[PDB]
Structure 1
Amino acid sequence: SFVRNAFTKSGNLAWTLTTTALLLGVPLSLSILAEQQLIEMEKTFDLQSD
């Protein structure tokens, strides 16, 4: 059915968008997490210093 065709096409598009979002965000997210952890580490070191 045309309604079924629209449903499957929308599902495929959503799957594609989710796949792209994960692929382009997960490494970025890990980079942000690492940078944010490192700045916290420097923060802690300083508070130790003074």
Structure 2
Amino acid sequence: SFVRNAFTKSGNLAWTLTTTALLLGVPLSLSILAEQQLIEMEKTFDLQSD
């Protein structure tokens, strides 16, 4: 059915968007997390010094 066709196509597009978002965000999210953790560690090291 045309309604079924639209359903499957809309689902496949959602899957493609989700997969692309994961692939392009997970490494970026990990990088942001690492940079923020390093910043917090530097702040802690400065607080220790002061």
Q: Structure 1 length as normaliser, TM-score?
A: 1.00
- Runs of 4+ with deviation above 2 angstroms: none
Structure 1 unaligned residues grouped into runs of 5+ = none
CA distance in 2, matches of 1:43, 1:10: 47
Per-residue CA deviations over 1:1-50 (Å, capped at 9, x if unaligned) read 00000000000000000000000000000000000000000000000000
Q: Structure 2 length as normaliser, TM-score?
A: 1.00
Structure 2 unaligned residues grouped into runs of 5+ = none
